[PDB]
Fold this protein.
Amino acid sequence: SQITIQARLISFESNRQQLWKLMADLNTPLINELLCQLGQHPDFEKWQQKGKLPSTVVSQLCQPLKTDPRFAGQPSRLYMSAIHIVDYIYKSWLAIQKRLQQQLDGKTRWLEMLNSDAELVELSGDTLEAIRVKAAEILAIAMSLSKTLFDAYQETEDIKSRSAISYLLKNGCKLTDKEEDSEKFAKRRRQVEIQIQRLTEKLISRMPKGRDLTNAKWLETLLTATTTVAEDNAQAKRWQDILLTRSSSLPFPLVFETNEDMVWSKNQKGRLCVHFNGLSDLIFEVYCGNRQLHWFQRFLEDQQTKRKSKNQHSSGLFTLRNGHLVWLEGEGKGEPWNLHHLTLYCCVDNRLWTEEGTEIVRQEKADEITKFITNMKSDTQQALIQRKQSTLTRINNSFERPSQPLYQGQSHILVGVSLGLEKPATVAVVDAIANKVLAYRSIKQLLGDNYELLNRQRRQQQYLSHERHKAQKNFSPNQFGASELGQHIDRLLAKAIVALARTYKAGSIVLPKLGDMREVVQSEIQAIAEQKFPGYIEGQQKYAKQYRVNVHRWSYGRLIQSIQSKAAQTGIVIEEGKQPIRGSPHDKAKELALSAYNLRL
Amino acid sequence: EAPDVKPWLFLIKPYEGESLSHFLGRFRRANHLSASGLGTLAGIGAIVARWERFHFNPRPSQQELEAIASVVEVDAQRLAQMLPPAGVGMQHEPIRLCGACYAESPCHRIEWQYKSVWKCDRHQLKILAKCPNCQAPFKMPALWEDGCCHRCRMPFAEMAKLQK
Amino acid sequence: SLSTEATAKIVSEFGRDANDTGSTEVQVALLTAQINHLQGHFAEHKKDHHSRRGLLRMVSQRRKLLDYLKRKDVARYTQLIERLGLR
RNA sequence: UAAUAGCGCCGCAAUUCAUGCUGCUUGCAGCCUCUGAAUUUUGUUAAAUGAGGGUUAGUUUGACUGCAGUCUUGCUUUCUGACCCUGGUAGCUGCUCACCCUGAUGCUGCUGUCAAUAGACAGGAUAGGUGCGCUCCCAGCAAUAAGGGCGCGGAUGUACUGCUG
């Protein structure tokens, strides 16, 4: 449901320079608090096993750095911004590492389980029919299915008769009469080996890096490498890998996770202003287009409404949720605080705009807070329960807000969206009780006046990829791509799909479980290419470049998110299902929506 | 059909220290094979055309040497003796020659490519890296068909007289 | 790259003879002269990517020439390191 | 002079139905006047796409209250228009070249005038090849993909853009 809106902040130099000095000084303990985990912390491998960072460890590394002679000059809210960012860095990276570990194991199982029909006969000492009969018994026992069969191979080895359980699993949890081609099986088993290899490589990841602004390592390395002689090829390359590294120009943003830690006001000139907790001397002026101003007026109205009411209304329902203050990169020459541009990005929960939507968040938080208090039931823990119960009481007192009746769709009408390489979207609206398609749309309809933009995107990707190649050979800085055009097209389709869902009173939009299509294609094309260029690895990589590149450029996750966002701002439910391997783009969309309807029970 | 013959090739016996590039080169002259033909017969594909150039960037694996062993009738453990021992760094750019010993055994010895070798100890002579008369660099050891310089046609055995 | 006079000056000082057109002493010294003129520009023009390619090549050649000389003759190597101010 | 072919787009033409068009049998009959899918065709002062590099806190897509009245901000991006340029000297620096053959995701390609030297002057995004483009093709160059040939000097214990500038 959340959105991010933005404004540039304007102030006189003294204020934009003082804030830069604090952020160039704050950017450094964001580096030192990474290193205090990256190599200093002894428990680190226990966290990599569990997949989660302990909720207090970054604060317990930061608390003694608050008096460090290098870091002591900063407000209490700038240290909380440091702790926030470093918590979110590790809390992300450990959660990436854990899903990779789980995938590697979850296929190391399957590379053991996957056997040819002849190997099952040898391993069982029995007929492939005896295996078909035992596979029929195992389905009769089971009737969670695929997991239950995996568990019944992980348990219940059963005098190697788990051979028949692998026979079900390789057949997609079904009986098969046909006996398989050993060349097709060799390609299949090789794809798993490739996925296993690729996972054992990706299992090791570069320990998350800090944004060093100082150039000190680079300058020290330059004067070392030019005046001294390396003792090894490894040392001479270690200096090369440092000297090639581009250094950052921007400090990490400030994060203000409490909405009240931004204070709003109106300037004499009638313009809006803002100030931050601990920087309450530095008034900043808001500059934003009238297409976004209504939120910045709402910020000040939410604040005035609470202050006019003796704090009896809660910022648990303030339209602003959190702010990220960032320096966007400028152009040309000048001091960093005169060259770059302070920009304030406000997280906003869009459903807090209206009274009917605010009531949803009131019920959502009142249920979550009630459960929290009953799960809790020590000294400061009682003070925390005072924060919570003052919220649980205050959240019932309403802000005066715009009214708009909630959208309601028919529980039987669904929009199916089918994504692919040639057709980025294609739509079928199904009445699932009639089994009747109400409408279909192809791309030429689904973004209408804008259909020239798909042809533009394909021209621009091809044109600009060649210009980047020509530019790199000359060391030109000019490096451009179609990324913002692809982002616009994915947003045009997201608006049109939801406008169509509203038009037909659909209860939900259905999006495919595409999963990691990029890795799957990379393994399939490799297992095939190894049969056509054996030993010539450069020829294996050249086999289907344009197909592999087009799959790595395929924006399916960004279109899926663009539709999710616009649907949840409108109130339409999102649902999911398996996308058919065969059929036209329409048939894919039709069967996808009907499948998601069948999954209701 | 054949009258009771056993399937065969022109097998060759390896010399006391020749390089895998040189041995494969002799094998594919004893039988008339191309480098990609020998790789195809062994079932390892285009790999052989690296090994003849000493392009051991990914090193010869146990499974690839066993595939070659099934063609050339030399076991994988005797094929491994025609490659550098574990951690002995070789160089695959300048092909190098003793020439004094090439009269005692016409072969390219693997040891002349080691980064640690600068003189032949049997003869106490500096190793060559180009033809002593015309300064031409030697062909890859698989191509040592004539046993002489390819430009000025001076025998490798006569380069014994022109070194150190 | 160096002026004509500057090459002639360097080769006449590190060369064992006026006809010593390409000894390791000469080559390493010339590379050292280039590198000493390129670090003064590359420390200032930090955006000049095309010159970091030139520097990293030119330092890596110097090291190969020095490693070759070290094994060939340690006395020549020691004198050359002194005369070029390297460590 | 040349650019025949291949590949990707753009419509134009059908041919086959529907997500469309007439009926009531709310699912059939019927056709292509629209709006759309699929195949196949085309290169017709047909039609439609059409990347030389740059320029505005630009306009419209906005909020609230019963389609009328108030308030309104200049954020981040995608197009369509329009206009401008096709650059100037003052240093620093990378790469490339003895000389040849093959010729690469190599460079170059507009109109007019003067020279017919390789370059100036004045116009200009129509700018080599086709309806429009390419790593494809044609023409010239090719040392600055790569491989091979090979001259004289330096080094020659594996280093050698290391010489011929």
User: Anything to note?
Assistant: Residues 91, 93-94, 96, 113-119, 126-127, 129-130, 135-136, 151 of chain B lie near RNA strand D (CB under 10 Å from a C1').
